[PDB]
């Protein structure tokens, strides 16, 4: 799409329909006449277009009305309501841009933001934009959180977020114009290499992949059509479903063979009855010939009964010979019908040990995508966020993704090396207690109106708690925390002095020996300027490999690489880094997934703020105090950078509405 309607698309909004959020802010319009709605929609779309066409400078209300035409520029308060709405909820003027209106003289309200990940930073910038007092508390000695970029000399490699998953409707598309990201497209061609270290033939590579894709659609069919979603009171996982489907396919292979040989025995048994009939006939033909021979011993002249006997037995012999020929005719037809069936049998097996191994790579890919064993993913919901996927090629931040959080961090009060230990929220306000990570006995107290918690789901999951909530988080919130899945996936960065791989290939796979190890170093990435190869440890392997030293892991890497490129073509790496995300105390994993027994609806529960009880009993219902952003709080874009980014924009909007009021709702 392009034009005004394209700007709505690039902002994840229907161009010709009002969203649920829009209905809340403009209930007058959406309940009103259809004509007004279309006016509204155009104003919204046009303003978005204006911002998107030039996102390096702030778009003021004045500048907006300036570029609007009649009859749309007539109602100036509608234009102001729209512009304010779009500014509040971070659809326009978000990220890094030159400010036309200088920051307000004095700040209103005070917000403490826990964590300076992308979600934290995105919110911070917005709240400061709205003229609030904002301080971020970060346990690490750097901003970015799960956006981690290794830098040494010329080597640059992301250990966390790495891929921009398409610019089509991506908020990162805006950011990429504001921040100098060297975005490079990823050619999706991925050659596979078996355990021995030799390429999978294009014969297999396609016939296995096609079967994989066919197997997934099958699980989807089991989920929706057959409603196979709960088994023995437990919720069915994607893994279970895939197993069930495969087994049914192995069953069909055998069912086919059984009914094929069953066809053979019936033909063979028809031949048996025909041969028995033929032997019994030759038996009689043999004897009847002898009788004719003996009857022909009576030489002429002979009486008529003796003549009759000769004639009679002659008829009876050619009559039975007629039968035998027709039975020998049938014999030839049944005998070739047996060579027909024995010529082309049904398939011998469903998948060979070589096939099943290549299929396991395809499963490992999925286990990398969801950062979890397929036995944990929800059958019904694992891919619920599919509809909201972006369009366009996937890209890599060639100069390292960290350039983004670092850029967002510019101009914000961020306390590094500050580990939040306790969050206290009451009717009158909040206090946050943190310690210095370096010397833990040194204590800090932060008093604020509102707390925005961007603690990773893994951190929120910790047992015993790393962060204490006073009062405890409500049942419904903590239940969502347990139900939701927080996965794990790790990276190995190999830095060489020379390129020994195919420079035109961005990624190549390695096929493991077992199902158990399908995720172990199963994929390699060639993305960066410097000679760097990046290897993935996914699925079950991810968790186990964290208890294994870097040297051993780098060894297994070189082993596989030598097997593929030549034993003396793979040098010793100059620099090596191995991530341990589940081990990391400020992450406790990689990113969330839809666990079995969870749904997309749990993500909504995560985003819902907390309102404390009253101080004095009988005092009025208080303001909401504790707010939640983060990758794990956005139903439609979970486990991503843009998803985090957006959740931060979301909460900043919600907090500003709560503490500065919404003047645009009138």
């Amino acid at each position: 799409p392009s034009g005004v309607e394209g700007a709505a698309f690039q902002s994840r909004l229907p161009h010709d329909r009002m969203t649920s959020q829009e209905a809340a802010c403009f209930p007058d319009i959406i309940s009103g006449p259809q004509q007004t709605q279309k006016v509204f929609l155009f104003i919204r779309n046009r303003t978005l277009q204006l911002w998107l066409d030039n996102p390096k400078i702030q778009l003021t209300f004045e500048a907006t009305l300036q570029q609007l035409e009649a009859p749309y520029n007539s109602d100036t308060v509608l234009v102001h309501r729209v512009h304010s709405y779009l500014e509040r909820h971070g659809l326009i003027n978000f990220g890094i841009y030159k400010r036309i209106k200088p920051l307000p003289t004095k700040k209103t309200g005070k917000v403490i933001i826990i964590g300076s990940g992308v979600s934290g930073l995105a919110a911070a910038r917005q709240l400061q934009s709205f003229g609030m007092d904002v301080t971020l508390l970060e346990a690490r000695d750097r901003v970015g959180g799960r956006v981690a970029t290794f830098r040494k000399g010329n080597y640059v490699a992301d250990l966390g977020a790495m891929v921009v998953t398409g610019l089509g409707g991506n908020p990162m598309a805006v950011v990429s114009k504001q921040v100098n990201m060297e975005l490079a497209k990823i050619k999706q061609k991925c050659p596979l290499y078996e355990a021995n270290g030799q390429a999978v033939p294009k014969e297999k590579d396609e016939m296995v992949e096609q079967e994989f894709n066919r197997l997934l659609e099958a699980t989807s069919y089991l989920s929706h059509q057959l409603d196979f979603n709960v088994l023995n009171n437990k919720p069915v996982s994607l893994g279970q479903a895939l197993e069930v489907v495969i087994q049914l396919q192995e069953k069909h292979v055998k069912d086919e063979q059984i009914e094929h040989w069953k066809k053979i025995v019936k033909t063979q048994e028809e031949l048996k009855e025909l041969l028995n009939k033929m032997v019994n006939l030759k038996e009689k033909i043999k004897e009847l010939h002898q009788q004719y021979k003996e009857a022909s011993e009576v030489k002429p002249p002979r009486d008529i009964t003796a003549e009759f006997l000769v004639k009679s037995k002659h008829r009876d012999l050619t009559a039975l010979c007629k039968e035998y020929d027709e039975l020998a005719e049938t014999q030839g037809k049944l005998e070739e019908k047996l060579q027909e069936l024995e010529a082309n049998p049904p398939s011998d097996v469903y998948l060979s040990s070589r096939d099943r191994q290549i299929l396991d790579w395809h499963f490992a890919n999925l286990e990398f995508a969801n950062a979890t064993p397929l036995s944990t993913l929800s059958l019904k919901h694992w891919d619920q966020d599919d509809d909201f996927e972006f369009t366009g090629s996937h890209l890599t931040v060639r100069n390292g993704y960290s350039c983004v959080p670092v850029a967002l961090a510019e101009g914000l009060d961020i306390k590094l090396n500050t580990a939040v230990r306790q969050v206290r929220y009451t009717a009158s306000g909040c206090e946050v207690i943190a310690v210095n990570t370096r010397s833990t006995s040194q204590t800090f107290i932060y008093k604020c109106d509102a707390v925005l918690c961007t603690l990773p789901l893994g951190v929120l999951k910790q047992q015993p708690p790393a962060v204490q909530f006073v009062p405890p988080l409500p049942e419904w919130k903590t239940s969502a925390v347990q139900r939701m899945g927080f996965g794990n996936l790790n990276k190995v960065v190999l830095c060489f002095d020379r390129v020994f791989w195919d420079p035109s290939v961005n990624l190549f796979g390695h096929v493991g020996s077992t199902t158990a190890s399908r995720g172990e170093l199963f994929l390699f990435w060639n993305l960066y300027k410097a000679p760097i190869l990046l290897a993935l440890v996914a699925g079950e392997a991810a968790g186990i490999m964290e208890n294994i030293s870097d040297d051993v892991i780098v060894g297994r890497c070189l082993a596989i690489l030598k097997g593929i490129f030549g034993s003396s073509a793979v040098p010793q790496p100059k620099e090596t880094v191995v991530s341990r995300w589940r081990a990391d105390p400020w992450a406790r994993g990689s990113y969330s997934y839809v666990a079995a027994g969870s749904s997309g609806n749990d993500y909504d529960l995560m985003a819902q703020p907390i309102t404390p009880g009253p101080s004095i009993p009988g005092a009025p219902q208080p303001i909401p105090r504790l707010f939640f952003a983060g990758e794990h709080t956005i139903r439609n874009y979970p486990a991503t950078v843009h998803g985090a980014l957006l959740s931060g924009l979301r909460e900043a909007g919600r907090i500003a509405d709560q503490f500065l009021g919404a003047m645009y709702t009138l």
């Binding site: 995508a369 966020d385 599919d386």
Partner: peptide, 6 residues
């Protein structure tokens, strides 16, 4: 999520 898959 699924979109990460190669």
């Amino acid at each position: 999520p699924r979109s990460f898959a190669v």
